[PDB]
Amino acid sequence: SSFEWFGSNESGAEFGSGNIPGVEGTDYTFPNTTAIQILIDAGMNIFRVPFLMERMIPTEMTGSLDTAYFEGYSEVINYITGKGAHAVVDPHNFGRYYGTPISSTSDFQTFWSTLASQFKSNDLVIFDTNNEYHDMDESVVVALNQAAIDGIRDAGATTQYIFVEGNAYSGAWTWTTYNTAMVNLTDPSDLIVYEMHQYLDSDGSGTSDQCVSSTVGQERVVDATTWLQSNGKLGILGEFAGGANSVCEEAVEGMLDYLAENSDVWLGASWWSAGPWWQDYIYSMEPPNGIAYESYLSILETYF
Ligand SMILES: *[C@@H]1O[C@H](CO)[C@@H](O[C@@H]2O[C@H](CO)[C@@H](O)[C@H](O)[C@H]2NC(C)=O)[C@H](O)[C@H]1NC(C)=O
Ligand SMILES: OC[C@H]1O[C@@H](O[C@H]2[C@H](O)[C@@H](O)[C@H](O)O[C@@H]2CO)[C@H](O)[C@@H](O)[C@@H]1O
Ligand SMILES: OC[C@H]1O[C@@H](O[C@H]2[C@H](O)[C@@H](O)[C@H](O)O[C@@H]2CO)[C@H](O)[C@@H](O)[C@@H]1O
């Protein structure tokens, strides 16, 4: 009841990015609908599913779908929506295609029309333009988000929310520093949500189980919250995590507390990450015994 959406990322289909196309069961896998079902049972209602653009539409952004990869991916998506939860389709590509930064709004628009055409009637799907643009020109990033919106709506997918992401890994703490221009995005359906990510280790990389302090999360979302409220925009924390210790748990709690106090603009949050190949990853939300499952799931359920 704190937020409209609260759930988790479901990783695996984006693994082994060095091997394109790669081999299912070896370089990558698709998420496990049984574990997902466990998390739905815990009360989560949104699941973000990363995938690789190059595996979904090989060779050129304007090309055809890879039927095998698309069918494995859409099985998970349609499992999530068939249970009533929102499913975020996430090209997990950092603004790049075969390593080169994306610089064609028309090719990107075509990619998004091809992809969104396959989910056009599913009002539980959420489209994510791209995961964590970075080290690119801001005008190109804004232009690519606009082109993604254009392709999604032109394909007849007009009822779905679209999660836009900014430059600088779409970090919340740096949002007003690099991504103010993102205010100028439009959508014929008026369903734009600004997705930001926030980790609590010193550099915000989310690669350590140690946080800066028990208060760093809230501190790192203040300015983004003010920006959302000032410009009449909506936001979602598409990625966040903390280590299995008291300081990190208090910092996550304080951050989520601040967001819930500002739920007029903050539509929810999604933990990074669940999925079947994480093993003892420091942030694993995957049942039955991921580190974050055991240390954090009960904490997150308090916001459900
Ligand atoms: C997908 O997730 C399910 C649920 O966690 C896995 O099933 C468990 O598998 C273990 C194997 O030792 C069984 O002992 C448990 O009883 C199962 N739990 C439940 C609740 O079903 C399943 O193995 C996973 N599949 C893949 C491909 O990883
Ligand atoms: O952990 C092994 C696994 O890592 C995958 O990359 C991870 C990365 O380790 C993590 O720091 C980041 O948050 O997520 C990415 C995947 O989204 C890698 O793709 C796999 O090949 C590897 O097995
Ligand atoms: O936000 C997760 C993201 O972190 C990336 O590291 C960034 C960091 O986010 C940013 O605050 C800092 O200024 O730059 C570093 C890069 O050196 C990381 O590269 C990603 O894998 C990760 O998804």
Side-chain angles (χ1 to χ4, degrees), residues 238-272:
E239 295 186 13
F240 76 106
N245 54 80
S246 174
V247 170
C248 281
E249 284 152 17
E250 293 173 322
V252 163
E253 288 162 5
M255 181 178 64
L256 296 177
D257 280 5
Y258 192 89
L259 300 181
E261 296 168 5
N262 293 278
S263 77
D264 59 327
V265 299
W266 286 107
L267 306 192
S270 179
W271 182 272
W272 183 274

Coordinates of all heavy atoms in Angstrom, one line a residue, residues 238-272:
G238 N 13.8 1.7 -10.6 CA 13.9 0.4 -11.3 C 14.9 -0.5 -10.8 O 14.8 -1.7 -11.1
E239 N 15.9 0.0 -10.1 CA 17.0 -0.9 -9.5 C 17.4 -0.3 -8.2 O 17.7 0.9 -8.1 CB 18.2 -1.0 -10.5 CG 18.0 -1.7 -11.8 CD 19.2 -1.9 -12.6 OE1 20.3 -1.8 -12.0 OE2 19.2 -2.3 -13.8
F240 N 17.5 -1.1 -7.2 CA 18.1 -0.7 -5.9 C 18.5 -2.0 -5.2 O 17.9 -3.1 -5.4 CB 17.2 0.2 -5.1 CG 16.1 -0.6 -4.4 CD1 16.1 -0.8 -3.0 CD2 15.0 -1.0 -5.1 CE1 15.1 -1.4 -2.4 CE2 13.9 -1.6 -4.5 CZ 14.0 -1.9 -3.1
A241 N 19.4 -1.9 -4.3 CA 19.9 -3.0 -3.5 C 20.7 -2.5 -2.3 O 21.2 -1.4 -2.4 CB 20.7 -4.0 -4.4
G242 N 20.9 -3.4 -1.4 CA 21.8 -3.1 -0.2 C 22.3 -4.5 0.3 O 21.8 -5.5 0.0
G243 N 23.5 -4.3 1.0 CA 24.1 -5.5 1.5 C 23.4 -6.1 2.8 O 22.7 -5.4 3.4
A244 N 23.8 -7.4 3.0 CA 23.2 -8.1 4.2 C 23.9 -7.7 5.5 O 24.7 -8.4 6.0 CB 23.3 -9.6 4.0
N245 N 23.6 -6.4 5.9 CA 24.0 -5.9 7.2 C 23.1 -4.8 7.6 O 22.3 -4.3 6.8 CB 25.5 -5.5 7.1 CG 25.7 -4.5 6.0 OD1 25.4 -3.3 6.1 ND2 26.3 -5.0 4.9
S246 N 23.3 -4.4 8.9 CA 22.3 -3.5 9.5 C 22.4 -2.1 8.9 O 21.3 -1.5 8.7 CB 22.6 -3.5 11.0 OG 21.7 -2.5 11.6
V247 N 23.6 -1.6 8.6 CA 23.7 -0.3 8.1 C 23.0 -0.1 6.7 O 22.2 0.8 6.5 CB 25.2 0.1 8.0 CG1 25.3 1.5 7.3 CG2 25.8 0.3 9.4
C248 N 23.3 -1.1 5.9 CA 22.6 -1.1 4.5 C 21.1 -1.3 4.7 O 20.3 -0.6 3.9 CB 23.2 -2.2 3.7 SG 24.8 -1.9 2.9
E249 N 20.6 -2.1 5.6 CA 19.2 -2.3 5.7 C 18.6 -1.0 6.2 O 17.5 -0.6 5.8 CB 18.9 -3.5 6.7 CG 19.2 -4.8 6.0 CD 19.6 -5.9 6.9 OE1 19.4 -5.8 8.1 OE2 20.1 -6.9 6.3
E250 N 19.2 -0.3 7.2 CA 18.7 1.0 7.6 C 18.7 2.0 6.5 O 17.8 2.9 6.4 CB 19.5 1.5 8.8 CG 19.3 0.7 10.1 CD 20.3 1.1 11.2 OE1 21.4 1.4 10.9 OE2 19.8 1.1 12.3
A251 N 19.7 2.0 5.6 CA 19.8 3.0 4.5 C 18.7 2.7 3.5 O 18.0 3.6 3.0 CB 21.1 3.0 3.9
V252 N 18.5 1.4 3.2 CA 17.4 1.0 2.3 C 16.0 1.4 2.9 O 15.2 2.0 2.2 CB 17.4 -0.5 2.0 CG1 16.1 -1.0 1.4 CG2 18.6 -0.8 1.0
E253 N 15.9 1.1 4.2 CA 14.6 1.5 4.8 C 14.4 3.0 4.8 O 13.3 3.4 4.5 CB 14.6 1.0 6.3 CG 14.5 -0.5 6.4 CD 14.9 -1.1 7.7 OE1 15.3 -0.3 8.6 OE2 14.9 -2.3 7.9
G254 N 15.4 3.8 5.1 CA 15.2 5.2 5.0 C 14.9 5.7 3.7 O 14.1 6.6 3.5
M255 N 15.6 5.2 2.6 CA 15.3 5.6 1.3 C 13.9 5.3 0.8 O 13.1 6.2 0.4 CB 16.3 4.9 0.3 CG 16.2 5.3 -1.2 SD 17.4 4.5 -2.1 CE 17.0 2.7 -1.9
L256 N 13.5 4.0 1.0 CA 12.1 3.6 0.7 C 11.1 4.5 1.5 O 10.0 4.9 1.0 CB 11.9 2.1 0.9 CG 12.7 1.2 0.1 CD1 12.5 -0.2 0.5 CD2 12.4 1.4 -1.4
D257 N 11.4 4.7 2.8 CA 10.5 5.6 3.6 C 10.4 7.0 3.0 O 9.2 7.5 2.9 CB 11.1 5.7 5.0 CG 10.8 4.5 5.9 OD1 10.3 3.5 5.4 OD2 11.2 4.6 7.1
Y258 N 11.5 7.6 2.5 CA 11.4 8.9 1.9 C 10.5 8.8 0.6 O 9.6 9.6 0.4 CB 12.8 9.4 1.6 CG 12.8 10.9 1.1 CD1 13.0 11.9 2.1 CD2 12.8 11.2 -0.2 CE1 13.0 13.2 1.7 CE2 12.8 12.6 -0.6 CZ 13.0 13.5 0.4 OH 13.0 14.9 0.0
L259 N 10.7 7.8 -0.2 CA 10.0 7.6 -1.4 C 8.5 7.4 -1.2 O 7.6 8.0 -1.8 CB 10.5 6.4 -2.2 CG 12.0 6.5 -2.6 CD1 12.4 5.3 -3.4 CD2 12.2 7.8 -3.4
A260 N 8.1 6.6 -0.1 CA 6.7 6.5 0.2 C 6.1 7.7 0.8 O 4.9 8.0 0.6 CB 6.6 5.3 1.2
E261 N 6.9 8.6 1.5 CA 6.4 9.9 1.9 C 6.2 10.8 0.7 O 5.5 11.8 0.8 CB 7.4 10.5 2.8 CG 7.6 9.8 4.2 CD 8.7 10.3 5.0 OE1 9.4 11.3 4.5 OE2 9.0 9.7 6.0
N262 N 6.8 10.5 -0.5 CA 6.6 11.2 -1.7 C 6.1 10.3 -2.8 O 6.5 10.4 -4.0 CB 8.0 11.9 -2.1 CG 8.4 12.9 -1.2 OD1 7.9 14.1 -1.3 ND2 9.3 12.6 -0.3
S263 N 5.1 9.5 -2.4 CA 4.5 8.5 -3.4 C 3.6 9.2 -4.4 O 3.1 8.6 -5.3 CB 3.7 7.5 -2.6 OG 2.4 8.0 -2.2
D264 N 3.4 10.5 -4.3 CA 2.7 11.3 -5.3 C 3.4 11.3 -6.6 O 2.8 11.5 -7.7 CB 2.4 12.7 -4.8 CG 3.7 13.5 -4.5 OD1 4.6 12.8 -4.0 OD2 3.7 14.7 -4.7
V265 N 4.7 11.1 -6.6 CA 5.5 11.1 -7.8 C 6.2 9.7 -8.0 O 6.5 9.3 -9.1 CB 6.6 12.2 -7.9 CG1 5.8 13.6 -7.9 CG2 7.6 12.1 -6.7
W266 N 6.5 9.0 -6.9 CA 7.2 7.8 -6.9 C 6.2 6.6 -6.9 O 5.4 6.4 -6.0 CB 8.1 7.6 -5.7 CG 9.3 8.5 -5.8 CD1 9.6 9.7 -5.1 CD2 10.4 8.3 -6.6 NE1 10.8 10.2 -5.5 CE2 11.3 9.4 -6.4 CE3 10.8 7.3 -7.6 CZ2 12.5 9.5 -7.1 CZ3 12.0 7.4 -8.2 CH2 12.8 8.5 -8.0
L267 N 6.1 5.9 -8.1 CA 5.2 4.9 -8.3 C 5.6 3.5 -7.8 O 4.8 2.6 -7.8 CB 4.9 4.7 -9.8 CG 4.4 6.0 -10.5 CD1 3.8 5.7 -11.9 CD2 3.4 6.8 -9.7
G268 N 6.9 3.4 -7.3 CA 7.3 2.2 -6.7 C 8.8 1.9 -6.9 O 9.6 2.8 -7.3
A269 N 9.2 0.6 -6.7 CA 10.6 0.2 -6.7 C 10.7 -1.2 -7.1 O 9.7 -2.0 -7.0 CB 11.2 0.5 -5.4
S270 N 11.8 -1.6 -7.6 CA 12.1 -3.0 -8.1 C 13.5 -3.4 -7.7 O 14.5 -2.7 -8.1 CB 11.9 -3.1 -9.6 OG 12.2 -4.4 -10.0
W271 N 13.6 -4.4 -6.9 CA 14.9 -4.8 -6.3 C 15.8 -5.4 -7.4 O 15.3 -6.1 -8.4 CB 14.7 -5.9 -5.2 CG 15.9 -6.4 -4.6 CD1 16.7 -7.4 -5.0 CD2 16.5 -5.9 -3.4 NE1 17.8 -7.6 -4.1 CE2 17.7 -6.6 -3.1 CE3 16.2 -4.8 -2.5 CZ2 18.5 -6.4 -2.0 CZ3 17.0 -4.6 -1.4 CH2 18.2 -5.3 -1.2
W272 N 17.1 -5.2 -7.3 CA 18.1 -5.8 -8.1 C 18.9 -6.8 -7.3 O 19.6 -6.4 -6.3 CB 19.0 -4.8 -8.8 CG 20.0 -5.5 -9.7 CD1 21.2 -6.1 -9.3 CD2 19.9 -5.8 -11.1 NE1 21.8 -6.6 -10.4 CE2 21.0 -6.5 -11.5 CE3 18.9 -5.5 -12.1 CZ2 21.2 -6.8 -12.9 CZ3 19.1 -5.9 -13.4 CH2 20.2 -6.5 -13.8

